[PDB]
Ligand binder design. Structure first.
Ligand SMILES: Nc1nc2c(ncn2[C@@H]2O[C@H](COP(=O)(O)OP(=O)(O)NP(=O)(O)O)[C@@H](O)[C@H]2O)c(=O)[nH]1
Ligand SMILES: [Ca+2]
Ligand SMILES: [Mg+2]
Ligand SMILES: [Mg+2]
Ligand SMILES: [Mg+2]
Length: 166
């Protein structure tokens, strides 16, 4: 069957692990354990196609971000995640995109910009700002909550549909 290699990147604490765990395991991780590099695999049907998702959950913490570029160059599509209540994580996005362009050696890499923690009221990044950033990259913007599950499937499946247009 078709395998899609997805990689989730973004600043420490924005909810990369929680998103992935909600998608694959259907529960919300409330605690914060910083990731080094973890892998998840799951067979799913997306738009009628049975396929295998291989998801790399990467470190956001600079202290844990060793050899991240190595694990990443194998990725086919990337979720670039920031948190809507963390302005710095949004500002950090451009540098994750640059890293991806480097590891893939291409300006045309399947990506989705994800604004996570949309269940939270302390918003400092407005939807329109994120829409504009995504538009400049030529990619979708989707808001998610790993807590409520809002947009979680949408984000990952959209990433798959982006790889498919590639
Ligand atoms: N309210 C809320 N909290 C969230 C959401 N996603 C993650 N969190 C919380 O934010 C914290 C960090 O989440 P985590 O998934 O560990 O972040 P990470 O990006 O994987 N961190 P790291 O880069 O260090 O591995 C946890 O306490 C988690 O419960 C969300 O959508 N809503
Ligand atoms: Ca929990
Ligand atoms: Mg993590
Ligand atoms: Mg390179
Ligand atoms: Mg503002």
């Amino acid at each position: 069957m078709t395998e899609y290699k997805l990689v989730v990147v973004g600043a420490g604490g924005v909810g990369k692990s929680a998103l992935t765990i909600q998608l694959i395991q259907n529960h919300f991780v409330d605690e914060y354990d910083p990731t080094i590099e973890d892998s998840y695999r799951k067979q799913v049907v997306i738009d009628g196609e049975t396929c295998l998702l291989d998801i790399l959950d990467t470190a956001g913490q600079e202290e844990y971000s060793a050899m991240r570029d190595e694990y990443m160059r194998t990725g086919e599509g990337f979720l670039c995640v920031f948190a809507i209540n963390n302005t710095k994580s949004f500002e950090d996005i451009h540098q994750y995109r640059e890293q991806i362009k480097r590891v893939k050696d291409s300006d045309d890499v399947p990506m989705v910009l994800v604004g996570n923690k949309c269940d939270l009221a302390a918003r400092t990044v407005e939807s329109r700002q994120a829409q504009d950033l995504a538009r400049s990259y030529g990619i979708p913007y989707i808001e998610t909550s790993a807590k409520t599950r809002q947009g979680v499937e949408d984000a990952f499946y959209t990433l798959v549909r982006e790889i498919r247009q590639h």
